Amino acid sequence: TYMNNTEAICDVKGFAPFSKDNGIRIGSRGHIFVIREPFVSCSPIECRTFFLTQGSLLNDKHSNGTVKDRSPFRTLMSVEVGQSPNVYQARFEAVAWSATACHDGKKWMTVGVTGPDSKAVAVIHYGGVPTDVVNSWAGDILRTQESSCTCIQGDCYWVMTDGPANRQAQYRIYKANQGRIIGQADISFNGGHIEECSCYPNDGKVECVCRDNWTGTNRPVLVISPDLSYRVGYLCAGIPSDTPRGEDAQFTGSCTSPMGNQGYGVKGFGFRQGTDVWMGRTISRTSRSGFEILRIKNGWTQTSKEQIRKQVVVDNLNWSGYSGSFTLPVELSGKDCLVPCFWVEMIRGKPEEKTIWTSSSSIVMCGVDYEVADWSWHDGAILPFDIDKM
Amino acid sequence: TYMNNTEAICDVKGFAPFSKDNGIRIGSRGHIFVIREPFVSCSPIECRTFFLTQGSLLNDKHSNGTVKDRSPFRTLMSVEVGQSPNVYQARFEAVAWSATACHDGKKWMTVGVTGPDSKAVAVIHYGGVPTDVVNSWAGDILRTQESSCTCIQGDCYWVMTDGPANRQAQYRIYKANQGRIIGQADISFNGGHIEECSCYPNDGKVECVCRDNWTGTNRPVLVISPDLSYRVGYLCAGIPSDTPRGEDAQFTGSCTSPMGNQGYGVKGFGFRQGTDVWMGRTISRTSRSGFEILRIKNGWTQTSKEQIRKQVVVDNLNWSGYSGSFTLPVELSGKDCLVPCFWVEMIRGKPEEKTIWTSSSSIVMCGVDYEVADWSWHDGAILPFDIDKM
Amino acid sequence: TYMNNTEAICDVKGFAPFSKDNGIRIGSRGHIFVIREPFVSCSPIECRTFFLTQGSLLNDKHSNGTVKDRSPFRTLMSVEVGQSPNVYQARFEAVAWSATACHDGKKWMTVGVTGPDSKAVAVIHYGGVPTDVVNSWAGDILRTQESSCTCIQGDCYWVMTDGPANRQAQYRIYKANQGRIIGQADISFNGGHIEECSCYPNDGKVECVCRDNWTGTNRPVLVISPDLSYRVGYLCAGIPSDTPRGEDAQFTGSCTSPMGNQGYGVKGFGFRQGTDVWMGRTISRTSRSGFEILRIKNGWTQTSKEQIRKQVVVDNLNWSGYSGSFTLPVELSGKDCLVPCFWVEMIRGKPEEKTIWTSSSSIVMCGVDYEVADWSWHDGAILPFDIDKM
Amino acid sequence: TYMNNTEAICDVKGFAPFSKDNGIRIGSRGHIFVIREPFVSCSPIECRTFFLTQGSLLNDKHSNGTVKDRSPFRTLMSVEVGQSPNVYQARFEAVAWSATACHDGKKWMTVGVTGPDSKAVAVIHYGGVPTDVVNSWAGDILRTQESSCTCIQGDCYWVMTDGPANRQAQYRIYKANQGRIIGQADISFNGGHIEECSCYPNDGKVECVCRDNWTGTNRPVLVISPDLSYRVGYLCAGIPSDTPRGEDAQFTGSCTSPMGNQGYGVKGFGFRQGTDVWMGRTISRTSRSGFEILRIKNGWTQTSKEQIRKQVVVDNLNWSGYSGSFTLPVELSGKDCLVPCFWVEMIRGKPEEKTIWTSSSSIVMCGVDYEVADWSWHDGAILPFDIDKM
Ligand SMILES: CCC(CC)O[C@@H]1CC(C(=O)O)=C[C@]2(SC(=N)NC2=O)[C@H]1NC(C)=O
Ligand SMILES: CCC(CC)O[C@@H]1CC(C(=O)O)=C[C@]2(SC(=N)NC2=O)[C@H]1NC(C)=O
Ligand SMILES: CCC(CC)O[C@@H]1CC(C(=O)O)=C[C@]2(SC(=N)NC2=O)[C@H]1NC(C)=O
Ligand SMILES: CCC(CC)O[C@@H]1CC(C(=O)O)=C[C@]2(SC(=N)NC2=O)[C@H]1NC(C)=O
Ligand SMILES: [Ca+2]
Numbered sequence A, B, C, D: 001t002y003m004n005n006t007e008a009i010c011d012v013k014g015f016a017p018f019s020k021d022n023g024i025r026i027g028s029r030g031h032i033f034v035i036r037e038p039f040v041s042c043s044p045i046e047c048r049t050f051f052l053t054q055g056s057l058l059n060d061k062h063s064n065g066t067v068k069d070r071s072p073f074r075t076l077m078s079v080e081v082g083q084s085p086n087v088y089q090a091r092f093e094a095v096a097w098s099a100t101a102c103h104d105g106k107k108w109m110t111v112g113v114t115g116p117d118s119k120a121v122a123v124i125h126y127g128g129v130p131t132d133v134v135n136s137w138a139g140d141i142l143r144t145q146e147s148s149c150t151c152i153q154g155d156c157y158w159v160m161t162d163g164p165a166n167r168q169a170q171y172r173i174y175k176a177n178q179g180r181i182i183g184q185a186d187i188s189f190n191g192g193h194i195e196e197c198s199c200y201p202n203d204g205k206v207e208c209v210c211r212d213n214w215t216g217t218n219r220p221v222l223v224i225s226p227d228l229s230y231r232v233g234y235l236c237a238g239i240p241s242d243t244p245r246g247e248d249a250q251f252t253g254s255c256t257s258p259m260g261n262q263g264y265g266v267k268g269f270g271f272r273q274g275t276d277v278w279m280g281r282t283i284s285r286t287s288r289s290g291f292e293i294l295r296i297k298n299g300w301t302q303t304s305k306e307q308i309r310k311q312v313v314v315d316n317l318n319w320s321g322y323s324g325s326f327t328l329p330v331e332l333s334g335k336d337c338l339v340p341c342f343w344v345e346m347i348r349g350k351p352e353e354k355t356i357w358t359s360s361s362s363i364v365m366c367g368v369d370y371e372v373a374d375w376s377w378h379d380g381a382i383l384p385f386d387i388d389k390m
C-alpha cells in the first residue's frame, strides 16, 4: 500500500531525542565504517540511517581520509536508526559518492550517483535493484539531496544539481514511481544557488530547504507540486541560518534572493509551521560547531525577526555539521499529521581535529507538543585514535 | 492482539535458570557494550534483555567509566535474552541514562530519559518511534524503574520519581496506550521513598516492589489498579531485603513505614504468593555480593519471620547488584497463570575491583513447581582486562 | 503443524557432505566461541548446529580451558548449520553443561542441564522459554544425549542418565509435548551402561545408539515405542565401534551384553538399515582420530562380520571426536523416507595438542543413494594459536 | 511460484553500477573471508553474492594462500549483493571448491563439488538441504560454472566439466527440479574446450558463454533447449575476448571452432543482443587487469568486427579477473524483458602482488537503456597487509 503522505506537518513546540548512534566512540574498538552525511528516511515500519561509506573502517589505515570524497569506493548503505554504521548490520544500497533515499509504502527507492566528475551517473534502485538512470546533463559533478527524498501517493520526488559549486549552476526536479522516472523539470533560478536539499511532505506538496553555496547565508526554499510546477526563492525569515554567515543584527531578510553576500555553506533544514518556521543552524557563525533550532513567528512568509522559541541539541564546544529533514509516517506515529524530525551529523577528524581521518555520528530529534530543555548530545569520542599515532 | 495479562502469578517452589549472557567474559575479546542495569521484558514471542549503554566497548579506552552515569552517551538498546549486549545483535531503543520497557501484545513501548539533571526529558517510544513525552516536574533527576514495565489489556503502567535520591522526593504513576499518555497520578508517601520499581501483573493489577534510598532497609510496595487508585507502603515481611541493611535478628517488620534506619540501597524485587512473598536480596548485608531468594509465609500481609524456602543463585564470594521482575506471558509458557521470573545483574569493575571501568552481565531465573538446588552462576570474567594495564 | 516423523529411514549407499563450519580456522582471527559437542537437529525449515559454550572466545585468555567442563559458564546456543559458533549469529538456548535439542514441527524444544554435580537441574525450554524441569534423581551428574532428540507426531523423547560414569548407573526415558513432561520410564539394564545417546526416528519409533563407558567396546542400542515400552541391549554387529577398543579380529558380537572388556568410550552413532547397520567409529582403536562409517550386512540383528561398504570422512592423521545422528525431515528433503545424517566433531587442543585450550569444529554428512568417495574434511586449523605463546 | 524466466533479454546501450563490496579494503580491519570467484544470482526477492571461502580470514595466518585451491576447507557461502563476504552476514551453502547457484522462484538450489581430484562429488542442495548427487564420471577434477545457473519454469540447468584443463575433456549438461536430477546430456565437442560457463535465460532457452582453456582465445558458446538438445560452438564475433589472447588486428572470427591458438584463459561472459553481442574482457591481452565490455554488431551470428559501443568499468592500471552473467528477474525489475547483468571479480595478492595471500572483491553492473560513462570502480585496497610483514 502506498503512503498517502498528504497530511500537514505537526505544529511542534520543541524537539525530543529519537536516537544517537555513538558510531565513532564505538568505532574506537568495533568495526565501523568511516562515513559522512548520515541521514534518516522512514518506511511504514522503520526509520533507517543511510550513510556514505569510504569503503573503509575506523582505526584502519584505509581511513586515510586524504584519498578523495568522490572516490570510486563510496557506497550508500543503511542500518536501523540508532544503530551505528557497522559492517555487520549494514544493508547495501547503491554505489554513490552522493545519494538520496525514501520509501513509498511498498518498497525503498534509493539513488546513487557515482562515475567521474565530467559525466556522473545516477542509478535509481527500487526494491533492492537498479530500475532507472539519470546521466550528468551539465558535465560538472551531478549531485543531490544527501538527505531523505519524499513520497506522496506513490510518486517520489527529489532535487538534483549539476554545475559549479560556487557560482550559477543548474537545478532540476525529478519525479518517479516504482523506481521509474515519469517526469522532470528545470528550475529557473538565476542569481540563486541550490544544493543538498532537505525536503519533506507538507499539505500534499514537497517543501525543500536547501543550501546556497554561492552568495547566500540565508537558505533557498522550494515548494513542489505533484505536476512539477513550483515556487522557489529564499526562506523569508530575517535571520540567517547557513554556515558561514554574519551576525543576526547585521542581516536583512528576503523572500526572493540571496542575502549576506558570503560563499560556502553547510547543508541544513527548516520546517514550515503555518507562516512560521523552525530553522536549524550551527551555533557558531563561522564553524561547523554547536547546533540549535529556532522558531521564527511568520518566518516562512515575512522578513520576521521574531524569535519565539530556541532549543539547543549540541553545545558550541562541540562539532556539528550537516542536518536534514524527514517525517514520521502516519502509520508509525499514529498521528493525523506528519511529525517533523531531523538528524544532525557530528563530524570528527580533519580538517578541525588533528588526525588522519574524518568521520561522523548523528543524533535524531523529533517534533513534540512540548518545550524540551536544551542539552548537548555531542559525539563524544576521544581524538586522536590508535592509527592516529601510526 | 493485546495481551490480557490479567491472570494470577504462579505459585512457585523455586527458580530454574533461563539464561546467562557471559557478556563480560565474552567482552574480553568480542565487541560488547559497557553496561549497567540489564533487564528482561517479554513480548508474546520473545523475552529480550534491555540495557543501558555507555556509548562504549569493553577493552577500549572509552570504557573510561570515570566519565559520568548520566552521560549524554547513554542509550537503551536490547538483544534477545541470553545473548550478550554486543553491537551487532543490538537493536536501538532510546536515548536514556535511565529507562523502562514493556510490550502490550502488538508492539514494544520503551521510555528513555535523557537531558540535564535540572530538567530531564523522558521520551516514550512505541513501535520503534517517539510518541509522547514526560518532562521533569520537580527539577531533580527524573527517573524510573530500570526494569520491565507492565501491560494489562492494552494499557501499560510504570512508576517514575523526580527529586532527591536520599530524602523525601516525589513519586508518580504514569499510564499509557499505544505509546500515548492517558492518565497519571501522584503517590502520597510522606516519610517514604520510592526508587527503581520492579513490577509485574498479578490478578489484573500492577504490583511493585521498589527501593527506599532514604531510611528504609525494607522495601516499599505499590499496588496499582487500572484507574490509578493505589495502595502503597512497605513489604510486611519481618525480614529486611535491601542493601545495605542490618541483621535479621535485629529487625522488626512493618506494613506501613520504613524500618532499619539506614540510607542507600540497591534495586531489588519480590513476588506475592497469596499472602506469602518471594524476596530477593544480596547475601551480604553490606555488599552487592552473593544473591539469594527467600519465601516468607505470610510475608505479604504480616510481620512474618517464617522462612519456608531458601535458594541461592550467586554465592557470596561473587559480585551481584541490581535485580528486577518480569512475567512470562501466557502465550509463550502455555500456563493459565503468570510465571514469575527475575534477572540478576552482576557488576564487575569499580568501585570494588581494581580496573578503569564498570560493567555487568546477568542471569535469568524463572519460577517452577519444584525446589531447585542452590548453586552459583556468577559472572566469571577475570579482572583486570587488557586496557586495565594501559 | 506437527512433523509426522513416522516414516522409515532411507536405505543409503554412502554419505555426501552437508556442511563444514571451519570454526577454529575462522576462530584464529574472528570472534568464535570455545566449544565442545556441536550437533545438528532440523526444523521443517532449517537444520541448526547446537553447541556447548565455555562462556569464552578463541584466542582469548578466558579460553583457559583448564577451568572446568561442568562450569557455571556453559550455555547451549545455536546457529544455522555450516555457520560457525560465532557470537553474532548465535541464538541463545539454555544454561547447560550438557544438552539435547529437537523440533516438533511448530517450535524448538531444548533441554539444558546445569547446577551442581550432586543435585543437577535440567530445564526444558520450548518456543524460547522454560516450560518444565527434571531434577537429579540419583545425585550424580545428571546428563543426556549431547545430540539431537526425537519428535514423532508432537511428542518428543530423549534419554537421560544419572549416576557413575564408569560403573552401573541409572538410565531414564523422558517424553514431552509442547515442552511439558507427560511420561517417563526407568530402563532396566544391569551390567550395561548407557551414555550420550544418538537417536533418530525409524518406522514410528525412536532408535538410539549410545555409549558404554563401563565395560563395552560395542554400543548399547535402544528402541523406544510411543508408550515408553522399550527394547535395549547391544548393537548385534560383530565389529566393535567405540573408542577405545581392540582389533576387529579379536572381537565377538553380542545382542545382549557388553563386549571387549574395556572402559572409557566416545559418543557415537549408528543407523539401522533393515537388518543391516551403518556404524561410525574413529579410525584409531585407541585415539579420537580419523573417522569412518561402515555398513554391516545384518549388523542390526545378527553377530555379522560382513562388511559391505566403507567410507572415510576424516583421515587418521587428523583428530576426530564425538558423532551423533539426526534426520532430514520430509518437509525439507522431499523424500518419502527419513534421510539419515550425521555430524562429526573435530577436537583441537588439549589433551593431545600443545595449547592452553580445547575446542572443536564439525562436518555434516547425509545419506545418499550413491557410493561416495573417501576423503578427509579435517578441521585444518594450525596449532598453537596467538594466546598459546602467552 | 516458479519464475517463468522465458522472456527475452533487454537490449541495452550500456551498464550502470549495481554494487561494490569493498571486501578487501574492509578486510584490512574487519572479519572477512578470503575468497575467489564471487558471483551473483537473484531470487524474486534479492540478488545475493555467492563466493568460495578458504575457511579463513583476511589479515590472519590461515590466509596462507599457498595451501591449495581445491582444499578440503573450501565452502560456498553467500551474502546479499553489495555486502562483503564477512562471517557474520554469511549464510552457509555447500562444501565446494567449485560451485554454481540459482533460484527457481520458490527456493535456492546450489551445487557444491568437493572430494578428491580423482573422484570428486557434487552435492545438490535445495531449500538449504542436500537433495541429489553427481559423481565424477571421468576421474579428473569434476567442476562447473563458478557463476549463476539458470532456471526456467521450475527446471534449472547448468554445465559441468570433467577432464583435463588444457586438452580435450568431457562436457555435460545437467537439468533439475526442486533439487532433483531429471535429465542429463553429453556435449559432443571434439577439438573444443568448455569451462566455467556464464549462462542466462534468453527467449526460453539457456545461453552460455564459457572458457576455452585448450587452444581458444575466442569463447565457446552453448544454447540449451528445455529438452537438452543443444547447439554449441564459438562466439562468431571477429574479436577475441579471453585472456590471454593476441591483438584484434591479428585475429579472425569463427562460429565453429577455436581461434588464436593459445592456451590458458579466464572465466568470462557475453550477452546476445539479437544478432549482436556484449562481450566482456580484460583490457590487457596478457594480464587479468582492466575490464571493458564491447558491443559487436552481428557478433552473435557473423564474423563481425563492427564495434558499435565500448564501456570501461576497471581501468588497466588495476587488477581484474573472473566475470560472469546473471539476469534481473521480472518480479524485481518490473520489466517485460530479462535485464542482463554481470559481476567482475577483482583479484588482489599472489601471483601478481607481493603478499602471502590471494583474495578478491567485486563490482556489479546492470544493463540500461542509456550509454554510461567509462570509469574505474577498482578494488582499491592497499597491499601488502599486516600479516604481510609477518
Ligand atoms: C557544494 C556542495 C557539494 C557540491 C559538490 O559538495 C559537498 C560538500 C561537502 C561538505 O562537507 O561541505 C561534502 C560532500 S562529499 C560527499 N560525498 N558528499 C558531500 O556532500 C560534497 N559533495 C560532493 C558530491 O562531493
Ligand atoms: C537512588 C537511585 C538512582 C537515583 C538517581 O541512582 C541510581 C543509582 C545507581 C546505582 O548503582 O545504585 C545507578 C544508576 S545510574 C543509571 N544510569 N542508572 C542507575 O540506576 C543511578 N540512577 C541514575 C538515574 O543515575
Ligand atoms: C561418560 C560421559 C560423560 C559423563 C559425565 O562425560 C562427558 C565426557 C566428555 C568427553 O569428552 O568424553 C565430555 C563431556 S563435558 C560436557 N560438557 N559434555 C560432555 O559430553 C562429559 N560430560 C559431562 C556432562 O561432563
Ligand atoms: C581451467 C579452469 C579450472 C579447471 C580446474 O581451474 C580453475 C582455475 C582458476 C583460475 O583462477 O584460473 C581457479 C579455480 S580454483 C577454484 N576453486 N575455482 C576456480 O575456478 C580453478 N578451478 C578449480 C576447480 O580448481
Ligand atoms: Ca552559503
Ligand SMILES: [Ca+2]
Pocket: B211, B212, B213, B214, B215, B216, B217, B242, B243, B244, B262, B263, B264, B265, B266
Ligand atoms: Ca535503603
Ligand SMILES: [Ca+2]
Pocket: C211, C212, C213, C214, C215, C216, C217, C242, C243, C244, C262, C263, C264, C265, C266
Ligand atoms: Ca566404552
Ligand SMILES: [Ca+2]
Pocket: D211, D212, D213, D214, D215, D216, D217, D242, D243, D244, D262, D263, D264, D265, D266
Ligand atoms: Ca583460452
